[PDB]
RNA sequence: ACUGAAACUGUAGUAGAACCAAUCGGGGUCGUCAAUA
């Protein structure tokens, strides 16, 4: 379930929420390919695409750049039947083929990507860092978003939402150096901004519809639980009656309340009335605060490939949209980008300890991107490549022209 | 005053793009109570 944001509010947009079904994490389909060769051998764009799907390159089905459709190819087996000939058309009928050793021709060959920036951001929660759960449990109001990950649950952060802090980041940017005001706009109008309408993708309205170049993950805690586990949480009705049992066995320290608290706290807010100084009962309400899970790091894929086709091959467009991605990830560094629910309410706030810029085929003038990173104002990128960015940042500035022409 | 035969409705096309499940809220605090005779 989810919603988008108001740019101007803030606030939940009127009209904008939406939910996705999904099948969940560490769900298996076979590798269902056959393939007839004219030729004796195996293509070699065939073995690429069999190397691009163990090394989980491919995406499939929809919300690619939201969270969603990343899979990976596991016990992957090649059977050879030669059916010019007699013995492999009755090997066909009768003997389940001829066996190729993959780790051979994997060896043997390359694997070639097309261009792609990946960032790995190590994080943990400077404060707790959750999305909310759409349902109030009864002993706890707001709870954990949790999602099923392979047998387990893991607290997942929907790289929906990851997204979309992303996203406003890069359009609050923009809007700031055009000093453009998005009060006046509609939702949709608000979101329609250069530079961020192929980071993050344009909606599909009759086209100026565009897929993001920019993918963030679904990122799931470190931290699993038995289904059963986490239901029994859910169901607590009582905060300090069944639910200290619930989390103790859910956090992994059935014999030790403070271990488990730790983990995660529950929190009650109260409203107190300015005129009496009474708690304004009806607002009392309950937080289970994620403090202390651990999260894997966030995945954010940026296809290069696909800028280029929006800017036409020509990689000096892409530099004032890796500017803007990299000023971005400054502000993701500096805490200037809380995630999830409550962020004004003591949520959110996010450490981030590590960047990991990995560009896979990336043209020699963006190569300086394969780096990682500590300080978060990335003085660990080349100066020289920080004044290149910088200054085709500064042009595209004094002319906000829509790259892509 | 003699059944035609034989012929794969297939071939190419990702149900997808976009959308932050979010906004506000100190776990707080002081005057009685009761109605008869």
Same mark, same amino acid.
């Given at each position: 379930? !989810? ?53 989980? +390159?491919?995406?499939?089905?929809? %919300? ?7 899979? &990976? ?11 010019? &000939? ?12 001829? &066996? ?10 390359? #694997? ?24 109030? !449990?009864?002993?706890? +109001? ?25 996203? =406003? ?27 961020? /309408?192929?980071?993050?993708?344009? %909606?599909?309205?009759?086209?100026? !519809? &565009? ?5 963030? /993950? ?17 169901? %607590? ?12 066995? @859910?956090?992994? #320290?059935? /014999? ?102 990995? !560009?896979? @085929? ?9 780096? =990682? ?24 500035? %004094? ?7």
């Amino acid at each position: 379930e !989810g919603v988008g944001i108001d740019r101007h509010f803030g606030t939940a947009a009127n009209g904008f929420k939406y939910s996705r079904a999904v099948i969940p994490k560490g769900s298996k389909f076979k590798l269902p390919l056959t393939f007839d060769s004219q030729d004796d051998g195996l293509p070699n764009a065939l073995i690429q695409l069999l190397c691009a799907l163990e090394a989980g +390159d491919i995406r499939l089905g929809a %919300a690619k750049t939201r969270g969603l459709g990343r899979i &990976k190819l596991d016990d992957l087996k090649l059977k050879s039947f030669a059916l010019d &000939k007699p013995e492999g058309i009755f090997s066909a009928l009768l003997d389940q083929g001829k &066996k190729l050793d993959w780790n051979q021709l994997k060896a043997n060959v390359t #694997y070639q990507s097309p261009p792609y920036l990946g960032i790995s951001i190590t994080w943990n929660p400077k404060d707790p860092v959750m999305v909310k759960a759409e349902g109030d !449990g009864l002993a706890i +109001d707001i709870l954990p978003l949790v999602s099923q990950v392979g047998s387990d649950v893991r607290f997942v952060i929907p790289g929906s939402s990851i997204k979309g802090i992303l996203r =406003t980041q890069a359009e609050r940017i923009i809007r700031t150096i055009c000093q453009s005001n998005g009060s006046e706009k509609n939702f949709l109008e608000q979101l329609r901004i250069n530079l961020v /309408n192929e980071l993050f993708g344009s %909606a599909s309205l009759s086209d100026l !519809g &565009k897929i993001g170049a920019l993918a963030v /993950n679904d990122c799931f805690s470190s931290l699993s639980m038995t289904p059963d586990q986490w239901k029994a949480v859910e169901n %607590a009705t009582e905060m300090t009656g069944n639910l200290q049992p619930a989390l103790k066995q @859910a956090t992994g #320290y059935p /014999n030790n309340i403070s271990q488990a608290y730790k983990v995660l706290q529950p929190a009650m807010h109260v409203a107190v009335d300015r005129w009496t100084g009474g708690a304004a009962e009806g607002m009392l309400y309950s937080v289970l605060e994620p403090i202390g899970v651990t999260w894997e790091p966030i995945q954010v894929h940026l296809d290069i490939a696909r800028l280029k086709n929006y800017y036409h091959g020509k990689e000096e467009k892409l530099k004032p949209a890796i500017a803007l991605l990299l000023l971005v990830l400054r502000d993701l560094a500096n805490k200037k980008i809380p995630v999830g629910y409550g962020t004004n309410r003591g949520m959110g706030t996010i450490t981030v300890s590590q960047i990991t810029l990995n !560009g896979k @085929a990336l043209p020699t003038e963006l190569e300086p991107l394969n780096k =990682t990173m500590t300080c978060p104002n990335l003085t660990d990128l080349d100066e020289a490549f920080r004044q290149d960015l910088s200054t085709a940042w500064k042009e595209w500035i %004094a002319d906000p022209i829509d790259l892509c022409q």
